[model samples]
Target chain A: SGLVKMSAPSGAVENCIVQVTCGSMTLNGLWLDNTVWCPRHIMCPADQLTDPNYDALLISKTNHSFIVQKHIGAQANLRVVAHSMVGVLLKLTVDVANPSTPAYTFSTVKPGASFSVLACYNGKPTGVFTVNLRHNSTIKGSFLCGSCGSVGYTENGGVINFVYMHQMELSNGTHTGSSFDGVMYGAFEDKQTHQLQLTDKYCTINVVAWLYAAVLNGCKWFVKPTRVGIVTYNEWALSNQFTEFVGTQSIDMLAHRTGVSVEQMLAAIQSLHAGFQGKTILGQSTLEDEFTPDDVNMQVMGVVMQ
Target chain B: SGLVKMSAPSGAVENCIVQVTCGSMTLNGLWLDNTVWCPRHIMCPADQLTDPNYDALLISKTNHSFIVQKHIGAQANLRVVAHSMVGVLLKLTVDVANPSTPAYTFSTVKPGASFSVLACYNGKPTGVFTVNLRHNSTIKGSFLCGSCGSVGYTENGGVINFVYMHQMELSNGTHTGSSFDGVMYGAFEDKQTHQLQLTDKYCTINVVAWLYAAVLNGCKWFVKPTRVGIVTYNEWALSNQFTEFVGTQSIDMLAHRTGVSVEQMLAAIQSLHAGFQGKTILGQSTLEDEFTPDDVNMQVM
Candidate 1:
């Protein structure tokens, strides 16, 4: 963890953009509002941080190191050591207008300690000692771990970027990222994984019973082999699944095994949306399920598709 | 059946209308095609038969008896004994060009027998015989019985008519009438009876599986009871008959009853279309399933 400290002579302005006067500081895009008490002790509200994707963008390019840049008369003199994939020393330096003296340097910032900076002007201290440190002292600054669903997210200049695992190797894994203004979140599972690839970038993605005895009281009816069979059958031409013996055979077996009758199954199927095409159409066909006739012109109708 | 013989001496003309010079006959609208072989044996093609409803139309009147008329210069006479609601003899009389001669009367037309008529001119045999009979010889004629779905039908002149029971009183009852050129038909049932009424004069009238084990196998599991509980809960809702349910306790009971964890039941409920709604939707909400605003607007939405 690295820290940055600054003293605005005007004391905690509403919002302050920190810039390096001399050397660059490897800050993980962390900036603090000076107006919020205790200048260096000021915390960056989560909303103030750039989009997380921007973080993914920067980290991807910088080999995981994010460097704060130099600017004109910016008064920040300390560096916050957040992280870089390569473990190296990070430095922060402050330069002032006085020709007789040199700049101030802070070195080797520890994980849990706050970095303290003394602001000077006209050869004397401005009575401003700013301390920058992690607000949640128990953990290092926001480090994405194996638990975060995505591999990482970053920022490059003004752009936002994100990176996610190509495939979900783990089941029941969760990942959180801020793609939009709000945090974009999702949960993954073996069930979800098997259906399709989980790697696509997304901002926001957008029955039942019959009479009681048939489904409830009859327990042994649709267990593994049977339930499995139904699912498999659904996968194969779901439209025609029931017409062939798929549903009928299952019910027959259920009647035989569970002491429930085939008539009950038949009765249940009667109310169910699953039925023969004609029956389904005559019964509960919804607008979404309605078959739309192909738009054919007289010419097309006259010609047969090869 | 009594048969009629005629000698036009001109031999088979395209279409001929024959009439008697004497008494009336109940011939059941029988006519022969002169162009066909054995003049009198020429049976009217079924397609040539008149409408069946007309049969009922005529039978409904006339005490169920149809009598044939007479005209002059006709050379055929015979009586075809068919049927009357009450047993009565139907007589066919043939009178010739000379009316002073006695009328020719033949009796008792058997169900399967074809009556042969000899054509004669000037008291000499014309070497030609004409016959008239039903194509289907099994019955005396078209006499509708229990097998016919309708009560009765008869031919008047050349038109067909039919009658049906006032209401559908039996299943698979057959009613035959010539609404169309071909025989018009219908099947009735006590099942058909319960639905409104079949009296509307219609031209055209037109389960479940289960349970436990397979559900059990998949059951780690809502395993069986968990799955069973959800199903049972759905049934209870179905029994109560609702579009939604709002509950805290029953879900708890279902969780306990099915041995399914409450979490599982809750998870299942999450997927179920039933959710929650407000007093504005229904009067009040207690645990009878419900639809949430999003469940509604988004649901509506």
Candidate 2:
């Protein structure tokens, strides 16, 4: 049978998880099992025990256990962050047979990224904040991509992780649509963190996370403008697997007509993009495409031959 | 003779001004006379009494703009900002008879740019901030390009305006060099406000401002690394009039290795670029170039 069932963990149980057949590889290869940290919840993928290859990329072997980062492929790296307090956090990631290459770096000298999240539970503006882990300036969550910030968690203990692959049915009030075929986020609570990333059901929706996935896929700074209007820009972003808009009537512009800059726009884009994709007034589905690394510039600087 | 002299204003005074010949047109054309708002001081590029063409392009008739979204060039426009105290502020701008056309806009749906600045006074980090004027939220300044933010002014009432043309001597401790003849900034205080922007003098250098000019001139996201590494990336930005660094050892990277993003990098690039140009620890000069709109996408979108 294509369906694999898993019971929710003992602690916070609701609809814990499920895994569907995605070719030989499951849809999501892993799901964080928070029970180990908070209390025991059910596993999502319910497949694959503690394997180094799968676990290595997500968690690291430091003196103690924490969410440290390793390269996309199999490369060793180290970065340390000081936290005033350590608690169970939301950690989201994706797996690739072969990771894509990164082109269009923000700066030759500057490292670049944005870890902003915007979640809308139904239609109201929901507040979600991530910890800035690098310098660990958790005082007020920082929003710069390269800031080595924190994971996103709501005051309600609700957490969200944004991964780039999906092809599941995500439904709500205005829209009921299935994403291409990557990983549909987990909708339940703290239980399935360990279900191995491969297992998954889905969540409410963080409109911004969806677009952020697209940005991670291959959304550069400008709109190619083959067509030059709203639909036109959508076409270009669609080509790159991105779902955000540009131009006068876009989320980006809404941020600007109001004079929002990089830091300010981070949350605006995430929140607005998510709003556009979820059960909103217009309720139109986003222009979508399959996930492919062809758009990413390089798979770890093709030059690193080791 | 090419020199023009105007006495320092009614208040604070010193080597307040100077004017050089720029054909029939003066260099900066206009300078803000802070005395109009801030009490008086010295002026830079002491020349030209306000004229319309020069004033119109940089400023406006009413506050709102884009009657019908006039792309980047002429016609009509309006944008209003609410300030807790609409106290008189410094406004900096450039005048172009034929503005260049904008090609690489940040987004078809998103108006793109960054207004971040990093300031360093003589080898030490200097704090210089601008107001985000549009939404009228002034609690903190913003650093995005299209945020419609406020013009940059120093806490000392030392305002700085960045124009994209220069070819003047901007020498200091570690280096002595002259730019290709464009508009050198005004270093003194608030006296030249009435002078048209063309009437010019000069000011201390902002290495970051220099690169920002280059970015405004045409420094896009990635280094077109026709040549990779440091020198290679420099060639690209240099070609574009940008004087910042890229790669592992660049202002962009310093902003990054330290975990900075677009907004944060704005101040880092500005301050560090300025530090590199001025003296403190390791004194050095930046690569130079003439300002050209060829790098910028267009005069106006």
Candidate 3:
């Protein structure tokens, strides 16, 4: 990621949109003073580009905060690049204009607002999540994948909060069991994908973990499956194939197959979100292994040699 | 309708679950409840019931707060009714099962929580509205139809808030124009259908309004077409024959055909949502009617 090596332009501005005339650039990956908004909507050069979606918007910054765009290319690393404009390209620079007025100003909720964000994978919505932003700075929403648990989110300058646990009541999956799972923070990555951490952050598993336990990580206790190829992003973010059983059934199997209890396994998996973190919001009604009396106990206290 | 006349059981309980052994009841419509929590998930007598989905659960109260369940027979009326056993029925009372170790205890968010409450009509999720409940009782989420503006929400015992203005970035057909439409309040009525006002309340147009402007109300400037049967709910919710145009093309046509500008039409439509109430989250990229400056000048005040 030569991104970090490229320094922020000294003459650039802050909090305002600056037109960059950078040459050979297919996307705009600019870093003003110091801030990273989820999906920066940039006017990209499409003809020279193969994928317009990711090319239209690129990540200028990476962190636990920036929401990743859905169709982002292989390099999410290349802040800026060019393959065809080999000629002299117009470079972009910021801060030249101030108070020019945001083109379409429409926010400042009367108390607050609520709505759903379509969750995407390769380049299509696969699920829907709920969002409940309060009057205060606090924001909240769901991450319902096949009617399961969710993630709590907060936008760039907004406040955070543990929203609510989501589950479909009509045989559709999801329930209150995963309620304590916790909330997440991020904003709409350009109305398509939501931003969370990766390679061990929130949304997808962490990098090292994917590089390590790619298989176990792919069989995620919470996420059920047909999984196959659709879930993995071609084995990049997830694995190509998933373990058996759709719901927590795989967990029941994993517990015995790998000698880890359901609790320990989930605990270990979540541990992997931290790099190294996770849980089973798995199973409904019948009540499985967790509750003969509904036992739950786990422990994690040490560093990894990795 | 007669719900208010039944009275809050004086000789009974409060806050806790109460089992009232009344008679001829198939579903539970208790009024424990000065506070109507969208849906009351009760174990109704299914054998005596036809539609278990709506029957197993019941709405013991009514207001701008309680959510309407899908497949709720003809009479959302009759808090409690029976035809068969019509014999000794188990009536539910409150204030009785206090701290009785709530069979399933989960909630009290760590700061808060988020999730989706599937929106249903005839007892199946056709769409979804999001929810983001904050620590301080404030809640929010989206009411995205085909990616459109959303409603701000607040559940009982919680604070209220206007969460966000939503619209799809893709060709999905929703935008920021509808964001000013404001928020609505209620909760996860049994995690099935989200509750909002009806009959001039919010979700569906008011009774009188629907009975009156059924066509115009059904053509809601925002929600568009093919609409045909899917939207009307058999003419009960909306009109069976909605005008053409999948998005707002219907609105433009309605403007000239019915002699109403897109602005006045939407204003009139939302007014129906209250029938009594509604806007369009239509079109994308290419600016239509309301521009010139990107010219947006219409007054709701």
Candidate 1 per-residue lDDT over residues A97-167, each given as its tens digit: 21211122112221122221222212111112222221111111111211111112221232222221111
TM-score of 1: 0.15
Docking class of 2: incorrect
Using lDDT as the yardstick, the better of models 2 and 3 is 3
Candidate 2 vs. true structure, TM-score: 0.21
TM-score of 3: 0.21
Which segments of candidate 2 are over 4 A away from where they belong? A1-306, B1-301
lDDT of 2 by residue, A1-306 (tens): 000001101111101111212113222111223211111111113343232233332333222233333221233232222211111121332232112121111111000111222211111111122111111111112122111111122111122222111111112101110111211223222222333222211111122222323333233221222223445434544444344342223333323322333233233333434433332211123321111111111111122223
- What's each prediction's TM-score? 0.15, 0.21, 0.21
Whole-structure CA lDDT of model 3: 0.23
lDDT of 1 by residue, B1-301 (tens): 0001111111111112232111222112212221101111012123432323333322443411322322212444433333222111112222223232211221332211222222121222111111212212111111111112111222122222221111112222111121111222232221223322233210000000011111212322222233324455555544443222234452334334445554344334333324223111111112212111111111011
How do the residues A133-245 of candidate 3 rate in per-residue lDDT, one tens digit apiece?
Answer: 33222233222322222222212222222222222221111122111222112211222232332221122212112211212323344332222232233243234121211
Model 3 residue A122 lDDT score? 27
Model 3, residue B153: what's the lDDT?
Answer: 23
Candidate closest to the true structure, highest DockQ: 3
Give a tens-digit lDDT track for model 2, residues B1-301: 0000001011111111112111222221112221111100011123652332332332333222211111211332122221111111212221221121211111100001112122111111111221111111111221121111111211112222221111111211000101112111232112223223222111111232223333332333322222234454355444443444422233343234223333333333334434333222111133222111111111110
